[PDB]
Amino acid sequence: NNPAIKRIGNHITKSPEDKREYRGLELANGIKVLLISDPTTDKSSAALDVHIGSLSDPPNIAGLSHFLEHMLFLGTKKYPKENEYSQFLSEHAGSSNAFTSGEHTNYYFDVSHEHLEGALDRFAQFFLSPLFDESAKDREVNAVDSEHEKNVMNDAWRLFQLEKATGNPKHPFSKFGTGNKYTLETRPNQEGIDVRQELLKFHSAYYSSNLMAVVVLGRESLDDLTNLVVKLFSEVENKNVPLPEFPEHPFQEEHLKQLYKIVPIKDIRNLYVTFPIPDLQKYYKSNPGHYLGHLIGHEGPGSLLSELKSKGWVNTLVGGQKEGARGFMFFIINVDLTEEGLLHVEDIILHMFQYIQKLRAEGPQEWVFQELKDLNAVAFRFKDKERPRGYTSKIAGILHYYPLEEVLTAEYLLEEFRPDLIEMVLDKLRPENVRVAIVSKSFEGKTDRTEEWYGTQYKQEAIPDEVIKKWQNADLNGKFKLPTKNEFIPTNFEILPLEKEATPYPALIKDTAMSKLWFKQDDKFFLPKANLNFEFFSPFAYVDPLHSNMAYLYLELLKDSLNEYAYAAELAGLSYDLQNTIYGMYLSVKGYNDKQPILLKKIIEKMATFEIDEKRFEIIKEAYMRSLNNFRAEQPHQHAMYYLRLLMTEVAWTKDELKEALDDVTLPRLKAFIPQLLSRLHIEALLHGNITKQAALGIMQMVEDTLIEHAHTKPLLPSQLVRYREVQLPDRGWFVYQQRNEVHNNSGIEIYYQTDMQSTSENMFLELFAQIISEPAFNTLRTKEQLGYIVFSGPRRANGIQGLRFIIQSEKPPHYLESRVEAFLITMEKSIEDMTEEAFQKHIQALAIRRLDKPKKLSAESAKYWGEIISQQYNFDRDNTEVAYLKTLTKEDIIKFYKEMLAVDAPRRHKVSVHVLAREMDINLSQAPALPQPEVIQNMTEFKRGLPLFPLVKPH
Ligand SMILES: COC(=O)[C@H](Cc1cnc[nH]1)NC(=O)CN(CC(=O)O)Cc1ccccc1
Ligand SMILES: COC(=O)[C@H](Cc1cnc[nH]1)NC(=O)CN(CC(=O)O)Cc1ccccc1
Ligand SMILES: [Zn+2]
């Protein structure tokens, strides 16, 4: 009945709360495809995944398949304009991206729902006749090198590659994924390689249709999506490439029983423990890896972490199966170490083996599997609806692993109980497979080897057999017990009926001196979850730097205490967030509403009758010290972003202020602080989800009552509710702050043009300008000028004030990035004058679609409202108000605004810049305007003292 379509799959099993409609099918050419029909989606999306990635790079050009990924975007035969694709999305409310794993390259985009076809068509071309333009290839190789450069100094990446580089060197596993300027131009030049050819070769070899999965999601009928996909994608070449496999492990027991001593960049202290295991993927229906993962990783009473944490040796632990490739995986157990811990490593690893030994002696436990099976089934049934980009991307990957029908459920549902497999994998977690890496500053000087790509310093040893034998004889250890029934598993999921007096936006259903309660019963998502947000205002949480440190430490200590208890709930999909703000504290409780008042009570109770364990205090303080220090190792752009926040906020305590005031925090002094901070508060809360007005009031009152009883809390005076103001920069003024980043050899810059207060009109002016320049900023500063990998434009908003910001991390100097951005601003004024009246309306419509996307999941609606509430703006209808107004703006309005606030010689141009310089300093392109001469900020206080502050914004 149809020659283009091999199979039509069946009734892809979905959660019965999922209203979206699905069809899977194999094409003639072998492409696996899922089609998602959602007649209500605001954005359509699609994704393609090719089962080939950087493991299939040729040896002589590292990171080629990653680089090829970068180039599919920059031009194809049918749509040859360098940024046809980029621009097409921008103009139609879309966004796009790609990643490359060892074994996949994965491409996704989303677009306004009615331009799915336009978007999708420009997209199919990536896989049919791309161009790899000679001029692009040349330019874009720099993007890759920046991306690598960004990664060079960050520990996560260094360890990641140092693993690869200590396995069998002949194994594809050992390769360098990212690539750089050296590997992809400098060197293929030296060895006479035409790269455009080499890209064409690879794309031709491997981007074969039998290695591809597609997901398309749109408002269209399933039958409509079907036709569309067949049209755009039947034309893909089947080169019948055999799928690569790696049946032989890269860790070969020439490589087992090794210890590695590693020098970190940040001052961190972890121990990595790895075991090579076979590929468990096929066992997905029983999932032994998860089971042993669930147990070893456990954090409850009688768990492994519990003991290590109790001898003060470790703080956090992570265990479980680790993805490798077709043919191999790892099983890992990783901990961070205390100072004491770093000296009892041998011991810690022994404790790990005692726990494994316990699991062997107890045997595999069906009741535990039954629990995992039940949590997973509940998780699946009541899973939140996904944003379409993530969703298509995600399924496109897993289409390569599961029958069409199982794609939605395969990652969730458990079916087979498999003692044998559990017992089999358990047999591999033995000292004679073990690999140990310790990462610590204490190995500086003491290392003797260097990893070539990132420059990592390490020493390598055999583990002395004394020590292996010593681990092999792991006794049972009475302090280790399996978890007991998880009491927190939800049993009640009944959706309460929508009330007689329910409203579309959160209602102010309580306004005492103690508390302001915002509430809305869920009229949208119908899952048995709720979101409970509380802002606790106390002025002592930021009164000074020392107090700030205590507010923090207090909160960490508390979290640390409850960890054992709450982890049970985390697994039952009930979780909490608790950190300190400049305003006081913040507390979220998210998840299956069923046992939710219970966790809340246990938190507030613990919070208000807290007892501090000295040894916990000691450790967490040392951790926080390192933590503050380690800011000096963060990326140049975060540095620049931070300094700006420091420059434009009425009050803010610097990292050095905090760390110097931190040696001053004794155990007795914190013990005073807590009862003190809790003594007067005000509380604003949003309660949102499957709960009733009375359930809500009860919860709010219950919180208050617990503080009143146990901490004697009373109300703050309304006038103590200081919110903080933004600094107000003069007309035609330009200030520069300058610092150096000591770790990173990129530099960074933020430029901020301050405009005015937030207001329906000023808001849209900035937003619309932001939109029109969004994609050209990126296309000019990265694609053409290749100034860096990190290139960001868009609105900035703080303390009620707003403006335009640019962020760039780059090889070239800040004063230079300044000129190219200011140059760019003129290019924009020109092309706004030049751009068609319909071209202009696209951007309006585009920003409108963007602004109007309905939240898909409950906690995404919550976020929007909490936005309004913590900002004291309380404009729950902003999206409608503000769109209405946007639709009535003209080319003329936006030019005035630009010539008013933004242009180089603007009447009211307020401009500050942060230049963060790299470790080491002190044409084809358009006309940069000559700039004023800046006022170089030398002192953050002398700076803020001498300028007006802005008014805080008006409510309602
Ligand atoms: C939830 O059940 C688990 O399997 C454990 C639990 C755990 C919680 N805290 C420490 N362990 N989680 C994990 O093992 C995390 N995994 C898998 C994952 O994140 O999907 C291991 C992992 C994570 C990152 C990088 C390599 C392995
Ligand atoms: C600084 O700019 C970016 O964030 C870019 C790409 C982008 C394209 N259009 C808007 N932004 N990078 C990423 O998002 C990073 N990806 C990798 C890549 O694009 O090469 C990281 C990543 C890693 C694992 C899973 C998903 C994404
Ligand atoms: Zn990349």
**Cβ contact 25:5 at 8 Å:** yes
Please tell me the distance between residue 481's alpha carbon and the centre of ligand 1 in angstroms.
20
- 69 among known catalytic residues: yes
Phi, psi of 516 (to 5 degrees): -125, 115
**For a pocket test of ligand 1, which of 318, 322, 398, 559 has the largest count of ligand atoms closer than 8 A to its C-beta?**
318
Q: Is 299 annotated as a binding residue?
A: yes
Q: Is 70 annotated as a binding residue?
A: yes
Phi, psi of 408 (to 5 degrees): -70, -40
* Catalytic residue (choose from 17, 21, 26, 69): 69
Query: Rounded to an integer, what distance in angstroms lies between the CA atom of residue 160 and that of residue 163?
Result: 6
Q: Is 445 annotated as a binding residue?
A: no
Strands lying side by side in the sheet with 95-100:
5-7, 21-27, 32-37, 212-218, 43-50, 105-112, 95-100
Atom 8 (ligand 2) nearest CA:
97
Angle between helices 614-629 and 545-571 (to 10 degrees): 110
- Hey, what amino acid is at 727? V
- Method in brief: X-ray
Length of the chain: 956
- Distances in whole angstroms, Cα of residue 842 to Cα of each of 44, 56, 944: 17, 42, 41
Dihedral sign from CA coordinates of 652, 656, 661, 663? positive
Tell me if residue 319 falls in helix, strand or coil. strand
Joined tokens for residue 135 = 């001029």
- Hey, what amino acid is at 942? E
Q: Is 298 annotated as a binding residue?
A: yes
Query: Rounded to an integer, what distance in angstroms lies between the CA atom of residue 473 and that of residue 734?
Result: 70
Output the ligand 1 site: residues, CB below 6 A.
290, 293-294, 297, 317-320, 322, 332
Declared resolution, Å: 3.2
Minimum-distance ligand 1 atom for the alpha carbon of 571: 1
Q: How wide is the angle at C-alpha 311 spanned by C-alphas 305 and 312, nearest 5°?
A: 85
Cross-strand pairs, 449: 458
Burial environment of residue 717 by CB neighbours within 10 A (0 to 12, 13 to 18, 19 or more): exposed
**Cβ contact 165:452 at 8 Å:** yes
Atom 24 (ligand 1) nearest CA:
322
Please tell me the distance between residue 97's alpha carbon and the centre of ligand 2 in angstroms.
6
**Cβ contact 690:530 at 8 Å:** yes
**Cβ contact 110:388 at 8 Å:** yes
Output the ligand 2 site: residues, CB below 6 A.
96-99, 789-790
Backbone interruptions in the chain following residues (C to N > 2.5 Å): 922
- Distances in whole angstroms, Cα of residue 195 to Cα of each of 60, 61, 75, 136, 140: 11, 9, 16, 12, 13
How many CA atoms does the CB half-sphere of 666 hold within 13 Å? 3
Q: How wide is the angle at C-alpha 13 spanned by C-alphas 11 and 15, nearest 5°?
A: 135
* Neighbour tally for 222: CB within 10 Å: 13
Which residues have a beta carbon within 5 Å of ligand 3, which is an ion?
147
Query: Rounded to an integer, what distance in angstroms lies between the CA atom of residue 758 and that of residue 899?
Result: 19
Phi, psi of 665 (to 5 degrees): -110, 90
Number of H helices, E strands in the chain: 31, 28
- Distances in whole angstroms, Cα of residue 568 to Cα of each of 164, 332, 376: 35, 22, 15
Report all structural domains of the chain as residue ranges with CATH numbers, in order of start: 1-243 (3.30.830.10), 244-473 (3.30.830.10), 500-726 (3.30.830.10), 727-956 (3.30.830.10)
**Cβ contact 680:945 at 8 Å:** no
Joined tokens for residue 521 = 């019963």
Atom 17 (ligand 2) nearest CA:
99
Tell me if residue 400 falls in helix, strand or coil. coil
Please tell me the distance between residue 13's alpha carbon and the centre of ligand 3 in angstroms.
35
Please tell me the distance between residue 71's alpha carbon and the centre of ligand 3 in angstroms.
10
| Residue environment code for 389-404, b if the CB has 16+ CB neighbours within 10 A, otherwise e | bebbbbbbbbbbbbeb
Atom 7 (ligand 1) nearest CA:
297
